[PDB]
Amino acid sequence: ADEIGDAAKKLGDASYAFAKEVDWNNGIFLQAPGKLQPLEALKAIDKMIVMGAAADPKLLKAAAEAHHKAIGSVSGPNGVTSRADWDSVLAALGRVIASVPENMVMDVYDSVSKITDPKVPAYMKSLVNGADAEKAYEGFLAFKDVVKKSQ
Amino acid sequence: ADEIGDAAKKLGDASYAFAKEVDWNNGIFLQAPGKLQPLEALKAIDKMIVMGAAADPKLLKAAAEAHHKAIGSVSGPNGVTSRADWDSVLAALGRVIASVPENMVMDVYDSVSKITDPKVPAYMKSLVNGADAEKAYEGFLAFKDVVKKSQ
Numbered sequence: 001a002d003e004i005g006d007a008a009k010k011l012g013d014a015s016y017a018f019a020k021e022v023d024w025n026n027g028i029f030l031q032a033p034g035k036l037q038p039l040e041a042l043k044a045i046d047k048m049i050v051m052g053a054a055a056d057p058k059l060l061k062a063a064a065e066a067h068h069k070a071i072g073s074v075s076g077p078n079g080v081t082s083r084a085d086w087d088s089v090l091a092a093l094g095r096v097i098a099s100v101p102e103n104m105v106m107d108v109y110d111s112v113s114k115i116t117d118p119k120v121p122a123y124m125k126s127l128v129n130g131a132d133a134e135k136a137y138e139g140f141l142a143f144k145d146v147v148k149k150s151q
Numbered sequence: 152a153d154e155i156g157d158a159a160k161k162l163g164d165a166s167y168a169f170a171k172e173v174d175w176n177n178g179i180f181l182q183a184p185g186k187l188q189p190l191e192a193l194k195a196i197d198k199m200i201v202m203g204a205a206a207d208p209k210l211l212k213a214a215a216e217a218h219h220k221a222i223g224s225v226s227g228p229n230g231v232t233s234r235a236d237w238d239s240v241l242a243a244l245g246r247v248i249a250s251v252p253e254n255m256v257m258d259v260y261d262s263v264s265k266i267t268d269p270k271v272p273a274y275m276k277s278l279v280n281g282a283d284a285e286k287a288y289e290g291f292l293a294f295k296d297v298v299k300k301s302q
């Protein structure tokens with residue numbers, strides 16, 4: 001057990017209602033988040049590859065295993081994993097984030113932002129309960145503070 | 152040095168002409184290989200996640216690092232990495248393949264085949280020199296024999 005695991009439980013309390021509202025079987029998630037921009041997108045994928053290569057290999061393995069288990073508990077009309085597997089995935093990914101320098105994480109974020117059209121977040125939010133999305137995000141802000149203290 | 156590295160050099164001799172002909176900046180590679188089928192595609196991604204979790208973590212790391220280096224040497228009108236980085240990537244991925252049971256590799260292949268429309272391979276080949284694609288594939292058949300002997 002660790003503090004990221006405890007924080008994941010709190011993040012799940014804040015975000016699971018939102019996760020249940022997302023239609024995970026929507027084909028839109030295969031599309032570019034805006035206009036297709038292969039050269040800029042490759043720069044974002046490169047930042048991700050740098051981060052993956054730097055991440056703790058055991059924690060990457062554990063995060064993959066948590067997603068396999070999560071796939072097994074998918075149910076209902078939107079393809080949402082169980083609450084326990086949601087929290088599991090959250091914690092395992094927080095451990096991966098904490099295992100690399102903050103700059104690597106920010107480089108991924110900035111590089112993906114550069115290819116994400118400004119309309120995309122609001123369009124995604126419009127498909128779910130807005131107050132549940134805001135609680136999820138408020139949860140995320142608390143969670144990342146715990147992740148940073150482990151990083 | 153190892154035998155997969157030697158075999159990668161031979162595979163590069165057989166396949167680099169084909170790699171130069173692929174337009175790696177074509178946006179088509181973001182599309183589903185056929186009809187979008189989220190439930191079947193999730194089963195394929197699950198097989199990939201199982202395989203990733205089973206793969207040697209050092210060899211996964213080395214394979215990510217080889218792709219970062221390959222991105223750095225991209226040149227020319229089609230986005231093709233250098234010959235040396237092509238071979239590097241080939242060898243690093245062969246090591247990853249060899250690090251898991253043959254069944255895990257076959258499960259990915261079968262699960263992706265199930266979502267790939269029969270027209271897709273011929274459409275891809277039609278964009279390149281067909282004889283260069285066949286040589287690349289003949290190369291691949293020799294290479295996998297070396298990979299299997301390490302597996």
Ligand SMILES: CC/C=C\C/C=C\C/C=C\C/C=C\C/C=C\CCCC(=O)OC[C@H](CO[C@@H]1O[C@H](CO[C@H]2O[C@@H](CO)[C@H](O)[C@H](O)[C@H]2O)[C@H](O)[C@H](O)[C@H]1O)OC(=O)C/C=C/C/C=C\C/C=C\C/C=C\C/C=C\CC
Binds near residue numbers: 110112113120134180
């Ligand atoms: C063949 C290739 C195959 C596959 C293709 C490969 C990849 C797919 C590529 C791209 C598609 C992926 C994602 C794009 C898809 C979807 C987008 C998902 C991201 C999103 O929706 O983000 C919304 C966020 C909203 O803006 C925030 O608003 C805040 C408001 O907060 C206030 O008020 C309250 C609010 O209620 C709160 O309570 C607070 O108390 C109070 O403070 C503040 O002003 C913040 O400063 C401001 O940042 O927008 C950004 O962060 C901008 C960058 C986005 C970068 C994009 C993404 C995140 C970055 C990195 C994630 C990492 C990786 C994502 C990618 C993959 C995951 C591994």
Ligand SMILES: CC/C=C\C/C=C\C/C=C\C/C=C\C/C=C\CCCC(=O)OC[C@H](CO[C@@H]1O[C@H](CO[C@H]2O[C@@H](CO)[C@H](O)[C@H](O)[C@H]2O)[C@H](O)[C@H](O)[C@H]1O)OC(=O)C/C=C/C/C=C\C/C=C\C/C=C\C/C=C\CC
Binds near residue numbers: 029259284
């Ligand atoms: C949000 C989500 C984000 C992203 C989306 C995620 C993923 C994208 C998902 C899917 C898109 C990816 C791929 C689909 C895209 C593109 C497709 C790329 C694959 C392709 O084109 O394959 C062509 C191949 C042709 O068939 C072969 O013909 C042979 C003929 O050989 C003879 O004659 C001569 C010939 O010249 C030779 O010299 C020889 O001497 C002589 O023997 C034999 O008859 C073989 O028995 C027969 O197998 O077709 C198959 O293998 C069928 C399954 C395909 C499964 C598909 C793929 C491979 C499987 C696994 C690869 C693993 C993974 C691929 C995926 C990713 C990579 C990591």
Ligand code: CLA
Binds near residue numbers: 018060064093133
């Ligand atoms: C099995 C299939 C699968 C699927 C469908 C997904 C889907 C996703 N992954 Mg995951 N992933 C997988 C397997 C999968 N992954 C595997 C096998 C690994 C390797 C172990 C990873 C490792 C991974 C990492 C390291 C990251 C993702 C992230 C993401 C998201 C990217 C888009 C995004 O940011 O949306 C928005 C995100 C969500 C809807 C998820 C919940 C986010 C918080 C907790 C609540 C919502 C807050 C707010 C409303 C929206 C996001 C704001 C943002 C600025 C934080 C998306 C939800 C990224 C992510 O979530 O970035 C924010 C991310 O950093 N994945």
Ligand code: CLA
Binds near residue numbers: 162169218285
């Ligand atoms: C950086 C960006 C990037 C890009 C653009 C790609 C692109 C691709 N990856 Mg790679 N990958 C990346 C990074 C990237 N990857 C990273 C960071 C990792 C983690 C370390 C991986 C790990 C990985 C694995 C483990 C595998 C791939 C494979 C593939 C291919 C999947 C589609 C396919 O089979 O086409 C067809 C494939 C090609 C055009 C590549 C050359 C194949 C041979 C050597 C020559 C051509 C033979 C024939 C004509 C066509 C293929 C037949 C097939 C049955 C073998 C595609 C070319 C898969 C693949 O190639 O499966 C066959 C695969 O198994 N990737």
Ligand SMILES: CC(=O)O[C@H]1CC(C)(C)C(=C=C/C(C)=C/C=C/C=C/C=C(C)/C=C2C=C(/C=C/[C@@]34O[C@]3(C)C[C@@H](O)CC4(C)C)C(=O)O/2)[C@](C)(O)C1
Binds near residue numbers: 030033117120
């Ligand atoms: C082979 C292998 O290993 O693959 C594995 C690799 C990983 C990394 C482990 C993995 C993973 C995670 C991944 C990739 C997550 C990707 C998430 C992508 C989210 C994409 C989104 C939100 C896309 C969009 C597009 C939108 C478009 C909206 C608009 O256009 C619309 C409609 C109308 C316009 O007028 C205005 C507009 C509003 C602009 C939108 O609103 O959102 C996975 C899944 O496991 C597969």
Ligand SMILES: CC(=O)O[C@H]1CC(C)(C)C(=C=C/C(C)=C/C=C/C=C/C=C(C)/C=C2C=C(/C=C/[C@@]34O[C@]3(C)C[C@@H](O)CC4(C)C)C(=O)O/2)[C@](C)(O)C1
Binds near residue numbers: 048053141211
């Ligand atoms: C060996 C191998 O194969 O590894 C493979 C391993 C994987 C995992 C499969 C893989 C992969 C994918 C990877 C690495 C994905 C990385 C994801 C990173 C996500 C980062 C995020 C969300 C970062 C941020 C930063 C934010 C900042 C927000 C704020 O600053 C803002 C604006 C304003 C401030 O006022 C307050 C604030 C709120 C602080 C935010 O909100 O979010 C890959 C590439 O396939 C390689």
Ligand SMILES: CC(=O)O[C@H]1CC(C)(C)C(=C=C/C(C)=C/C=C/C=C/C=C(C)/C=C2C=C(/C=C/[C@@]34O[C@]3(C)C[C@@H](O)CC4(C)C)C(=O)O/2)[C@](C)(O)C1
Binds near residue numbers: 078
């Ligand atoms: C088709 C289908 O059914 O698919 C199903 C597939 C599944 C897998 C079964 C499934 C599921 C679950 C899923 C996708 C869960 C996704 C979870 C994503 C979690 C992401 C996390 C935690 C990312 C971050 C990034 C962080 C960054 C933190 C920092 O940068 C910040 C901010 C500020 C810096 O100053 C400090 C910092 C610390 C560096 C962090 O702290 O955390 C589902 C829903 O069932 C759908």
Ligand SMILES: CC(=O)O[C@H]1CC(C)(C)C(=C=C/C(C)=C/C=C/C=C/C=C(C)/C=C2C=C(/C=C/[C@@]34O[C@]3(C)C[C@@H](O)CC4(C)C)C(=O)O/2)[C@](C)(O)C1
Binds near residue numbers: 133192
């Ligand atoms: C080859 C093939 O077929 O592969 C298949 C493989 C798969 C895995 C099966 C597959 C898949 C599934 C995938 C990747 C799913 C990814 C899901 C990502 C969902 C992202 C969502 C919901 C994003 C948001 C962002 C929002 C933002 C809300 C806010 O910012 C807003 C506006 C303003 C403020 O208020 C603050 C805020 C509250 C922060 C929100 O509210 O939500 C797919 C697509 O089928 C393809």
Ligand SMILES: CC(=O)O[C@H]1CC(C)(C)C(=C=C/C(C)=C/C=C/C=C/C=C(C)/C=C2C=C(/C=C/[C@@]34O[C@]3(C)C[C@@H](O)CC4(C)C)C(=O)O/2)[C@](C)(O)C1
Binds near residue numbers: 184
């Ligand atoms: C977040 C993160 O970590 O992401 C990283 C995760 C990884 C795994 C490390 C990673 C990787 C590798 C990946 C995903 C490789 C994916 C390869 C996909 C190839 C897709 C292809 C060929 C798609 C198609 C679609 C086609 C459609 C053709 C047709 O429709 C057409 C025109 C006309 C119809 O009438 C007939 C038709 C002929 C049917 C086609 O012919 O081909 C990467 C890139 O690094 C990103």
Ligand SMILES: CC(=O)O[C@H]1CC(C)(C)C(=C=C/C(C)=C/C=C/C=C/C=C(C)/C=C2C=C(/C=C/[C@@]34O[C@]3(C)C[C@@H](O)CC4(C)C)C(=O)O/2)[C@](C)(O)C1
Binds near residue numbers: 200
């Ligand atoms: C911890 C963590 O995050 O790990 C992350 C790590 C990654 C790597 C980023 C990641 C990923 C992606 C993964 C695993 C991809 C796996 C790819 C597997 C590819 C397999 C292939 C091509 C298999 C085959 C089999 C074939 C068989 C062909 C033949 O039998 C046939 C028909 C007919 C016979 O007569 C002769 C024959 C010729 C023998 C073939 O031709 O090809 C993921 C999921 O993101 C998780």
Ligand SMILES: CC(=O)O[C@H]1CC(C)(C)C(=C=C/C(C)=C/C=C/C=C/C=C(C)/C=C2C=C(/C=C/[C@@]34O[C@]3(C)C[C@@H](O)CC4(C)C)C(=O)O/2)[C@](C)(O)C1
Binds near residue numbers: 298
């Ligand atoms: C937009 C842009 O510019 O992107 C740029 C991005 C880059 C990265 C810079 C770039 C590049 C390079 C790229 C993509 C290289 C891709 C290489 C893929 C290699 C795949 C390999 C080896 C896969 C396999 C699978 C195997 C399976 C073998 C077996 O199953 C088989 C058969 C039969 C079983 O009985 C035994 C077995 C042994 C189990 C194997 O043996 O090997 C490029 C081109 O520049 C484009």
Ligand SMILES: CC(=O)O[C@H]1CC(C)(C)C(=C=C/C(C)=C/C=C/C=C/C=C(C)/C=C2C=C(/C=C/[C@@]34O[C@]3(C)C[C@@H](O)CC4(C)C)C(=O)O/2)[C@](C)(O)C1
Binds near residue numbers: 173175176179271277
């Ligand atoms: C959010 C966002 O924007 O992400 C961006 C991220 C990136 C990385 C920048 C990005 C990208 C690039 C990607 C994934 C590139 C993937 C390339 C895959 C290429 C696959 C090819 C060529 C496949 C084939 C198959 C063929 C088959 C030929 C044969 O079987 C045939 C018919 C018959 C026999 O003769 C035998 C044979 C000879 C075997 C062939 O000849 O070729 C993208 C798309 O821009 C999206």
Ligand SMILES: [Cl-]
Binds near residue numbers: 002
């Ligand atoms: Cl505890």
Ligand SMILES: [Cl-]
Binds near residue numbers: 006
């Ligand atoms: Cl505490």
Ligand SMILES: [Cl-]
Binds near residue numbers: 035
């Ligand atoms: Cl636009």
Ligand SMILES: [Cl-]
Binds near residue numbers: 152153
């Ligand atoms: Cl040697």
